[PDB]
Write a protein that binds this ligand. Structure first.
Ligand SMILES: Cc1c[nH]c2ncnc(N3CCC[C@@H](CO)C3)c12
Ligand SMILES: Cc1c[nH]c2ncnc(N3CCC[C@@H](CO)C3)c12
Ligand SMILES: Cc1c[nH]c2ncnc(N3CCC[C@@H](CO)C3)c12
Lengths: 302, 296
């Protein structure tokens, strides 16, 4: 670990996983030995994917998540490094395994069959977070997971900010991506709040417009609420009450959708961290995420 | 001539242990997962080493951290890797494996990395004098036949006391592999190959395929829980009942266990009948355990 200049990095707090994905002709019959058409060993997870996108955009970035030593962590660490991601903030667990999965994509019908391996590795805690020196970060993005612990992380950033001049304040964003009640208290934190179409739909909202208008009362004064709605583009709503929208930039053919949401989030953060307007950041997010949809993985999203 | 050589594949097996076989389009949580060194010839080496037999492995490997895991695993077992055909181009093959805990059924989705297979030229470089037995996992047929001819030629310039015993495994039902029938003192033919050729039992497959073997060879056919059979030059059919564990939890590498145990028993001077029983016994014990430890 080298010298990191003060206020230089974008930190993403969240999950990492190893997805081994095999493309097959037909679904394997039990007890057989078959040859797949293609196989990919892919690093995944929301905060993890956002870090890859930030590095490709030209931002110094860091990942903070829980990992346990082992073969899976070795591959994942080498993959983060291959993507220029700073792993120095990883919270190494003394017991357990790093999450991984085996996925089979049937070419004949596009069906995804997944076998998850999760040893319920302890999440990043408020005590893990207090030990971090915040000065090297200009932006902190939190993937909503263990809400009561994450609220303490958010309150610690808020206390740091109170004692800083405006140019030295750390910008904060949160993502509420899973429809779990406990996460809904995170709407009340951060400068930028991302709400997924899936959470919006589970809350009974039928469009990005309904979601923003219906959830804006849950956000902090002055915060921007953002909701991507796949092929319908994305919307943002700020304190001025003006609903902002950008149309989608669909690829010629959609090849890979995992994790186009994470590419959108990382692109919005990047553009806002560069001093661009909410409208400009929305458009940039739609452009990059839309481009990612027609590409396998993250190469060439530029 | 004190080591046993196995020529074939070394594969990283990513294993998921499930309570029931996954239904298509489902998302399930497995009981447990592990990385295990696989590949047929590679698994036979693991078994030969636990049986106490000095052994060596010969197959293609590409450098990296996965190869570092495979190599350190070979070395931990005490398998000699000095003959590994190290590549500069490609990556190590890996497979996604499902093991059903309710019956021990194993389902393998192999990723073949187009790694160049071991050639006749790579084998010519092998100093045959250190080996008492050479087993070849059938893959690139024409190249393997030249390796077999090289062992045959070596044997002609040796007394019957210093002759290298040869075994061949025809596991995949691929036409090219049927010439290997063919060569060697012992020919292992899978139930899978036998069924594809229209045979319904190990005995019917042995009578139907004995014409294809070289003079004085022994043809061996394992048939899972029906046990295993063998046929030698005397025309006498030999059978061994299986040794099923009360709870079959992992049959991954059970076939490799049977092959290595038969080879070991025969390399020790036991009869074909005794070697068959031994193969069934060790493979059966393996079936009731996860992996290879405790087969003793
Ligand atoms: C990389 C790694 C795998 N398993 C680990 N377990 C504990 N600490 C680690 N390290 C030590 C070097 C410095 C640091 C990375 O930047 C953390 C690791
Ligand atoms: C552009 C596109 C075509 N088909 C899609 N399907 C799903 N998501 C999409 N994304 C990714 C998230 C962000 C969203 C902003 O427009 C676009 C697309
Ligand atoms: C003993 C047993 C129970 N269930 C099995 N299922 C598959 N193979 C089996 N093996 C291993 C290969 C060799 C075969 C010996 O004839 C037995 C078994």
């Amino acid at each position: 670990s080298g010298l990191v200049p003060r206020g230089s990095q974008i930190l993403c707090v969240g999950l990492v996983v190893l997805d081994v994905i095999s493309l097959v002709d037909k679904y394997p019959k039990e007890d057989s030995e078959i040859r797949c058409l293609s196989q990919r060993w892919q690093r995944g997870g929301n905060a993890s994917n956002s870090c890859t996108v930030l590095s490709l955009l030209g931002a110094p970035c860091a990942f903070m998540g829980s990992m346990a030593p082992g073969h899976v962590a070795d591959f994942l660490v080498a993959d983060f490094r291959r993507r220029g991601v700073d792993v120095s903030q990883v919270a190494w667990q003394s017991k357990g395994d790093t999450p991984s999965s085996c996925c089979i994509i049937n070419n004949s019908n596009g069906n995804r069959t997944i076998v998850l391996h999760d040893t319920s590795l302890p999440d990043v805690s408020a005590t893990d977070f207090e030990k971090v020196d915040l000065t090297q970060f200009k932006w902190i993005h939190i993937e909503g997971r263990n809400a009561s612990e994450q609220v303490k992380m958010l309150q610690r950033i808020d206390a740091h900010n109170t004692r800083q001049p405006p140019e030295q304040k750390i910008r904060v964003s949160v993502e509420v991506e899973k429809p779990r009640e406990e996460l809904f208290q995170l709407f009340g934190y951060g400068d930028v709040v991302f709400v997924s179409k899936d959470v919006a739909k589970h809350l009974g909202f039928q469009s990005a417009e309904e979601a923003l208008r219906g959830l804006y009362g849950r956000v902090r004064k002055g915060a921007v609420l953002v909701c991507a709605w796949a092929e319908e583009g994305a919307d943002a709503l700020g304190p001025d009450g003006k609903l902002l929208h950008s149309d989608a930039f669909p690829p010629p053919r959609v090849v890979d959708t995992l994790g186009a949401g994470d590419t959108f989030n990382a692109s919005v953060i990047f553009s806002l961290s560069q001093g661009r307007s909410v409208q400009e950041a929305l458009r940039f997010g739609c452009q990059v995420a839309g481009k990612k949809c027609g590409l396998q993985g993250f190469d060439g999203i530029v």
